[PDB]
Amino acid sequence: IIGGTESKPHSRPYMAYLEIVTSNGPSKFCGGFLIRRNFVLTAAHCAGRSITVTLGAHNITEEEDTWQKLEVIKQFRHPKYNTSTLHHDIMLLKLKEKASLTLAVGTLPFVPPGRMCRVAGWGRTGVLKPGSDTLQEVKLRLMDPQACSHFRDFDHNLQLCVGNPRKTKSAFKGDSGGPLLCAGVAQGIVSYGRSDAKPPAVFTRISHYRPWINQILQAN
Ligand SMILES: CCO/N=C1/CN(C(=O)N[C@H](CC)c2ccc(C(=O)O)cc2)C(=O)[C@H](Cc2cc(Cl)ccc2OC)CN1
Ligand SMILES: *[C@@H]1O[C@H](CO)[C@@H](O)[C@H](O)[C@H]1NC(C)=O
Ligand SMILES: *[C@@H]1O[C@H](CO)[C@@H](O)[C@H](O)[C@H]1NC(C)=O
Ligand SMILES: [Zn+2]
């Protein structure tokens, strides 16, 4: 997160920290969020050979009793996820066990331009800075779809256009998959933007994918 501030520890108990294993490189990281005691929502571009999820974290380098580290048994990447157009950037992760409900760990159960929303993550705090140790958050403006025109594949039915171009606030590398909360409901998921972090950025519009989400959760 660029231009944000450190979150009050454990104030976003649905936040998931994802470590992504691939077979040919070192580990990568994404955010995500707990929608059911055994399901994490995140971005399809976070998929890999295997993933481990840490719940209950604030400072990701300092183990504490709030931590729940859980194995992912299956990844359900959206079947239409397209690496050319970048549409349908969404994935469910099924956890091996049900997470415990604690002060630090809970679910986040289930919109037009103008509204201020919040995003949170452990990602880079600058173009050339490392990922944050601690969970950071920022407030971002929802924009009219026109503000995202220069993303040629942007589609207002599937995606939200997020961040006032006059400000430097943005999600960045490592924040992928994290929720956009507007009035305490998750409305989007960090998807993509410019390499230089100049806003706005493109978030997956969660309402369009609700039938798909329900179908996976009911069959599992
Ligand atoms: C639809 C496909 O979208 N692809 C990406 C690229 N991307 C990654 O590939 N991230 C991997 C994790 C899967 C990654 C790579 C490097 C690092 C690092 O810290 O170097 C962290 C995570 C990302 O992390 C991007 C982060 C990001 C978010 C926004 Cl909102 C704006 C710009 C931006 O990156 C330049 C998001 N999307
Ligand atoms: C996170 O925890 C580590 C190990 O305790 C500590 O060195 C580091 O300063 C912490 N980072 C913070 C609070 O930003
Ligand atoms: C991705 O989308 C483009 C345009 O919609 C399409 O031509 C392509 O077949 C889709 N599938 C893949 C596998 O990229
Ligand atoms: Zn704690």
Q: Report the C-alpha gap between 64 and 75 in whole angstroms.
A: 27
Residue closest via CA to ligand 1's atom 25 equals 173
Can 133 be counted among the known catalytic residues? Answer: no
How many whole angstroms separate alpha carbon 136 and alpha carbon 155?
Answer: 28
Atom 13 in ligand 3: residue holding the nearest Cα: 82
PDB resolution in Å: 1.8
**In terms of domains, do 142 and 220 share one?**
no
Q: Which domain holds residue 40?
A: 13-107+208-220
**Same structural domain for residues 78 and 95?**
yes
E strand spans, the chain: 5-6, 15-21, 28-36, 39-42, 50-55, 68-77, 91-95, 116-121, 136-141, 159-162, 179-182, 185-192, 201-205
The answer to whether residues 65 and 103 belong to one domain is yes
Closest by alpha carbon to 90, among 219, 220, 215, 213? 213
Helical ranges in the chain per DSSP H: 210-218
Ligand 1: nearest atom to the Cα of 130: 19
Question: How many whole angstroms separate alpha carbon 217 and alpha carbon 7?
Answer: 30
C-beta of 125 in contact with ligand 1 (< 6 A): no
Bridge partners (DSSP) of residue 74 are 94
Smallest CA-to-CA distance from 13 within 120, 126, 165, 116 is with: 120
Please list, in sequence order, all residues whose beta carbon lies within 8 angstroms of the beta carbon of residue 59, skipping any fewer than 6 positions away. Answer: 9, 133, 134
In whole angstroms, what is the distance from residue 63 CA to residue 115 CA?
36
Please report, for the domain that includes residue 37, its CATH number: 2.40.10.10
